[PDB]
Amino acid sequence: MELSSLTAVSPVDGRYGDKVSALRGIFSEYGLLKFRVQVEVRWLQKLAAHAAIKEVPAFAADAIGYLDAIVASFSEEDAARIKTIERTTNHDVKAVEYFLKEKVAEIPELHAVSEFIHFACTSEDINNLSHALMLKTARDEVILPYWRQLIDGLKDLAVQYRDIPLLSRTNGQPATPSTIGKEMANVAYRMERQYRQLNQVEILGKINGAVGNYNAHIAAYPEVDWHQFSEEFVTSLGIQWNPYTTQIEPHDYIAELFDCVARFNTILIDFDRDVWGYIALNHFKQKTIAGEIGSSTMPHKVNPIDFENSEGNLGLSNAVLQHLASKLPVSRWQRDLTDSTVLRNLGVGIGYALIAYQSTLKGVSKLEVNRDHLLDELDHNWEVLAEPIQTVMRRYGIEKPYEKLKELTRGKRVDAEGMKQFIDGLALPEEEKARLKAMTPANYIGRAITMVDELKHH
Amino acid sequence: MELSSLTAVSPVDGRYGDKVSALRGIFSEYGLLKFRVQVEVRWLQKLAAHAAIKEVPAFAADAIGYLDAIVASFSEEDAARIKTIERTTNHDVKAVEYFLKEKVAEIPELHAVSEFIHFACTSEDINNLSHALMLKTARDEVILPYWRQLIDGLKDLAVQYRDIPLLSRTNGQPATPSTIGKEMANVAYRMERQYRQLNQVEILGKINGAVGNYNAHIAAYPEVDWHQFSEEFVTSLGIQWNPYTTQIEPHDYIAELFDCVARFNTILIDFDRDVWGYIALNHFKQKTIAGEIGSSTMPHKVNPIDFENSEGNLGLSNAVLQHLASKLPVSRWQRDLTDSTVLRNLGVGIGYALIAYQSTLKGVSKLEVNRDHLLDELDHNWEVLAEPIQTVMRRYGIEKPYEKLKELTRGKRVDAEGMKQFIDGLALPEEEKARLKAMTPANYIGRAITMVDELKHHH
Amino acid sequence: MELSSLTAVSPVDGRYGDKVSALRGIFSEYGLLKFRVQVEVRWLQKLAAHAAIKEVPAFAADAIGYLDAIVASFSEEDAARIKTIERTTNHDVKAVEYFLKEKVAEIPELHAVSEFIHFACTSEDINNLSHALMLKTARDEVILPYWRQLIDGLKDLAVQYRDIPLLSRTNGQPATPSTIGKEMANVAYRMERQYRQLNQVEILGKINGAVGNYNAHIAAYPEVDWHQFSEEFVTSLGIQWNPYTTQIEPHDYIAELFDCVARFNTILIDFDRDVWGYIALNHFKQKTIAGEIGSSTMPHKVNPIDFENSEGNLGLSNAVLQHLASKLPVSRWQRDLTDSTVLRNLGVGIGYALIAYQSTLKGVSKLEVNRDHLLDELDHNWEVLAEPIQTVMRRYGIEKPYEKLKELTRGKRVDAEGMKQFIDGLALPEEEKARLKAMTPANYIGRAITMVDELKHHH
Amino acid sequence: MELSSLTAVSPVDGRYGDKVSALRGIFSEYGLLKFRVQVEVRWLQKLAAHAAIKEVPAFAADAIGYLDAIVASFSEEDAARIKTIERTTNHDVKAVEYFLKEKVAEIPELHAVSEFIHFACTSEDINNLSHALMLKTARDEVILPYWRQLIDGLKDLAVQYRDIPLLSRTNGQPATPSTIGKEMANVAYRMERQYRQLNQVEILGKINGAVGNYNAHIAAYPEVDWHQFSEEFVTSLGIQWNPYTTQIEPHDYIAELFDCVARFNTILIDFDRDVWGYIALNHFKQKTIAGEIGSSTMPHKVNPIDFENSEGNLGLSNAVLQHLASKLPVSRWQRDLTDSTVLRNLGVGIGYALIAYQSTLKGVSKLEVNRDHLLDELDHNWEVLAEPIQTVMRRYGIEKPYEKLKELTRGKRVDAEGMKQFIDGLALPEEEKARLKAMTPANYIGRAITMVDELKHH
């Protein structure tokens, strides 16, 4: 069978292919080849612009334009030609070199310096810079914008549900109340920390020849400061310079990038699970679309499939991201080639994540808080007032406060009247007694609401 | 950009797409849908053949042929129709049901029992059986055949290199010799163990309604023995029966299946790495063709790129296989849907492995043992004879045998002459002294050759 | 600070030390050394009993008893002596050899064949056999017994709760009912599958010299069939023979063993989580004793801390088990020593699991099903009867059955009365209408109870 | 059997127990209890020092001293008492509370405010701050110093071997030369990046009650600004404040801490492997100790067991660190208790790492570079000069330079005379021809030496 979204082995290009279309122009073989062409061309232009390198005179305006067009117009047809050449070379980057030499052959000025294409370069000089550009593009144009959508989305939920009381669950058991909004706020805050970290991750690049010592460069141009030339070229591409490497850029920054993405994903997994649970408890109703089918056999079903889809894909994302993070930075001696094939999977780990981000956003858009249920549940759990009562008792020196409340509530059902009766028998100033009799599980929410309102201050 | 092998995000469908084409008809959405249709059709066919279920009379030959054709000729166009219907249902299995209902509408016999399609079934009854069929097919038609090629390949190398001496390396250091063939035999033996295990793994399936208690089945047909019905149906598909489940088949067998593939892949990583190193030591030269480029900058390079490609892909395979193996069997209460999207990746872990198997076979085809280097290295490591000498001394009661050889060789360079002189000073019977003076690093290979020759007698 | 359970870095030897005491005599350095001594002693004993090896005459009863005593009475003091000798050798197995040599010196018979201790052996010949003995002992005396307790425990719950109705949850939502007992039975069945698998795993061992070719053995005794000698010795230890290896036993069986324990642990995590949730839903209340504190701040709390402790430890167990399973079988060339230090952790992964098994059993002992809540919840979810109604409608040819019930219940609240009214308007034979009007969420449990009663007939 | 280093199940407390003794006072149950006592006491002191909280008057000098002594003198006997109390409570932190109440009972001033011990606190307020102190102490006093030793060690090797030529290996094959020192320098640089990152990781702490909303605090003291009180207390402990949490501190920073430690460990694994290989190639000899045994059967053996031990333990370390990093940040709703038992393993992942750090240092101390072998090997690989020759040809416009050199060397043995003969036939200016004939694989090292000398500038 020919490849199509229906026949694709992986769901990243298959069932969810339309959810990650932007990655097809970045992490695919086409994307890799596109970026390699960009790097090769930029290298030739720097050599030409470098006065000390007389063998490569400055290019005329039209020659520079011809070169820039090769970069900007790079097509699948161009990539297909490179692969055709690769059939002969069985070496992808050499095929890129030969492809570029073919392209400039018709332009005398360029053909003249044809043998300067890839001059003194090793394949990894081209590959690592290509990977850097792929990752930088992915982060700045795709990943961060989804993270911002998720963060803004959670904040909106926090504000929207700021004052909606919730019977908290610790150890899965009824506990001291909070508000739906506050529980949303906690997640936004965590996501924000990771967003800052991802944005601060360095994206490194290098260019220094075969084993990282500019051997070939120096042999031909011993008078040129290639260490300076290297830093200038890498930074000219918008990449941060990595001065010490072997044949390959070590890949530590890729682990740094993926580790933070995995942390964010983990926070999202936690969120997907919690909401799945709130929906199970009926604290949230789900918006329904006319025509849709919840269950093939149970007509009444309305399921949180978006949160579940996201949860599953986040696990897959982390499995791939984690493997790359831990495996890439280890390479035998000056390097073994196992990282090449692995690096063709940078978009895979990212892709599962993007699919999950969209699913979560989709699930969030269908949330309908159920205040009635939330409040009704709280009204059936007056035992949660045992904490404040004992704490107040502690304040006013009443003996064994915690112990007395434990005797009253642990393993015992106690309603409002019962809790109220206990308070009345306490040796406390009327003012405090009345203050205690005035609280309910629904209003025993502490600083929850204000916590939500102050989030914007962090 | 439209999807093509060039724009595909994953190299399983991209760069290596042509290496795993067989999986496109199995693990993809098209494959999933095709098997779902097969299961649905067979379910309807069993209901018809069941005399006690009179509302669905036995189907005549032409109707059975029409149903069989739906299964056999299932096309991408058919899959597209289901996807079109799914746009409305937002439920894939329900779209399959509607698809089939549309298909039988033109056959009165079949159209008359239209509402019996998916009768009493829950989506997972169809899904789990499809996954089982997908995995069984992949194992018997794809995985095992590659494993047999690797095993036979290693065995061929074992025989071909049965008597070629090798300076063994323990802790990376020169050690007691072996033969290239013996080192290959060890790997083939480990591979065979996993082969037998994978083949013995159970591929389970179930069919029992919404939560596993045949609730719906019994509500409509209380006089029918659905437990028996279930076992017959699952086994009729060539799948092994799993009588106890919630809404989903628990997936334990998937972990069992993936755990053995991972063990096999691990053995292969070990192999890829060892050969990469033997090539690094120049114990093997590499066959290459004119035109091929080793390095873009170093024209003299000839690299073991096939073994490296395999090694990298095996790591990826195991990472995906292991995630599925450990995550799938955990599902909240009667099931949470997180396993659905994950199960659409059964072929991904398998795909990375297939790519690796082919790369290794390619690498193996290019190996050329370098007898000259192997022997020359052995002739510069006569210190390895310290072990046999001390051992012989132990036998004949000579004092501090091991200790004496350690003082003589640890941290010291000793050639054939120096080792010979030492043996001469030993208080051993002439015959034993001669035997020791007759051995060399190259012939101090123990039972290596016979071990290789006897491999065929195992497994 | 001196080491004590209070200062121990790891909770396996610290807080939970008393929960895994049996492992101290197996996987610790003391245990490793004890088994090494056992293997060394048995090796010497076989050499003596082998008539062809005349330099080591058969041992008389008292000498055999003295050797057996070294093995049987091996103490921490003996272990300390070896560690003392190791301070000089910087090689543990060599220290064991010297230890034994010192021990036999007082027995002329044994002292006379002193240099035959460790004869022709490489350290791994002793190590791998010790690991095999450690794992076999742990499996047969520790792991399986806990697994049997869990399985029997789940089966007891299954029987005890066989007929207690439960509103099932799929996607976390109210679904077709089952029984508490049926949900327990499902787990017991999965556990039994892994139990059989773990019991069937092969525990392999080898003994063949420095690199696996009996080089040293053949150099001294070329007329002896060491391949046969090897198989006899390994099997005499109750271990299964692995004829092909490098310096180390490849460790594939360790992965096979650990892969099944991990699958079992995964099933248990699934269980711990489900029960944690059933407790959260108040389907089960928890037994607690006076004096116990649930929360330091919320006096009303009663938490399922036992299940939570188990769940956390199972994750830890699998993480260690999986690392060993995937890393151990890869060793550079004839072996690199990275597996030695790692193999000192065989008991760690097992320890986390043992802690978890005991915590779960403790949690189970405190469960008290809450029939009132389970039934009350079911009585507020009559919408689950939409499935059986539509299914019956399908049987009797009523049009758009599923679709009609969806419009009636999806996103809508429907009580017993509303469901009853709907059934009355259906064009079905009186008998079928009555049957539908007679069912309730609580009795719509299908074959749940019989499934539980038939569990005993499986496995 | 009773617990001893010989009977310990885990080698962290067993065979290598003496290698991690410092962790016994930090991550053990004793350490956890010690820190919990510290937090509880500090909390009581802040309440006393807080003027607005009149029910807890400022403490006299001797009372404060008595409290400080409880913290500073905390012993195993004290910890044993807490565990004895825990037998009754089956709740560790409550046992700590009761233990402290017992300790102050003899001091009237303290006994007077006995019920203010743990006032309004939830166990996790104490636990998370304890974990923060454990991790901060471990990083600043143990981990970073080992990393600094390793970094300084690699730098010393770099300087010591700065000019020692090495036949590089890419794909495991003879490649463009470098120097032993440069290969050491690359590793030091990578380790330094992680050191900076680990040092910059935030160590967070919180204190806000049952579910994070100061519910109990406000119920008793509605006039006190508990949000300010919280930030002050956490920062007073030297911990960074985490304002938004549920019952537990989310643990994201722990993942951040462990992820960077794992990255460092991975770099070290790569190093352990490379040196193991250099030793296998005989580029490094190993120092030998009189009396030691390399092999029980092969008398001549001298093995790099220290690097191997380190490699094995680094893998174990990462397995544990990774599990904690990915599992801890996920907790059901306001929290499930699975993280408590897991957090008792913070020292385990760290312990394996420390054992490995020491083993690597030990292995490094035994390295003896073998210049003779290194140089002899290079002198047998004149084919590596094919790169510079073709590059020079490229510079001077000689047709198909790379192609001509490939024909000459790919799959062919070419010695100095052969390479020299090829150069003589080139149409290049004598000056360049002589420059090429003057190089050897040993001096074709590019900027390697200078790269090493400039490391100190980064």
Ligand SMILES: Nc1ncnc2c1ncn2[C@@H]1O[C@H](COP(=O)(O)O)[C@@H](O)[C@H]1O
């Ligand atoms: N040392 C190297 N650096 C960069 N590319 C290489 C190196 N060695 C081989 N290659 C080529 O890199 C490509 C790797 O392909 P793949 O394994 O599919 O990722 C192959 O086309 C090789 O010919």
Ligand SMILES: Nc1ncnc2c1ncn2[C@@H]1O[C@H](COP(=O)(O)O)[C@@H](O)[C@H]1O
């Ligand atoms: N409980 C369930 N069992 C089987 N399929 C379901 C269930 N709940 C929802 N679905 C459907 O299964 C599909 C899951 O899609 P995906 O997440 O992409 O794997 C969706 O089309 C859902 O409508």
Ligand SMILES: Nc1ncnc2c1ncn2[C@@H]1O[C@H](COP(=O)(O)O)[C@@H](O)[C@H]1O
């Ligand atoms: N090739 C080998 N086979 C078995 N033991 C070895 C080997 N090489 C070194 N050893 C010893 O094995 C022990 C490994 O200790 P450890 O790294 O703590 O597990 C050390 O005492 C070494 O002297």
Ligand SMILES: Nc1ncnc2c1ncn2[C@@H]1O[C@H](COP(=O)(O)O)[C@@H](O)[C@H]1O
């Ligand atoms: N929600 C909670 N927060 C803090 N501690 C708890 C909580 N629930 C139970 N505990 C106690 O925490 C301890 C956990 O012990 P372990 O599982 O061994 O780490 C037990 O002593 C419990 O009684």
Ligand SMILES: O=C(O)/C=C/C(=O)O
């Ligand atoms: O193609 C390169 O740039 C390098 C190849 C190699 O080192 O083998």
Ligand SMILES: O=C(O)/C=C/C(=O)O
């Ligand atoms: O589609 C089904 O078969 C089941 C759906 C559900 O349980 O929600």
Ligand SMILES: O=C(O)/C=C/C(=O)O
């Ligand atoms: O101690 C041994 O048995 C082997 C040691 C080695 O191969 O180095």
Ligand SMILES: O=C(O)/C=C/C(=O)O
């Ligand atoms: O002990 C505590 O602080 C909290 C306990 C709980 O939430 O259950």
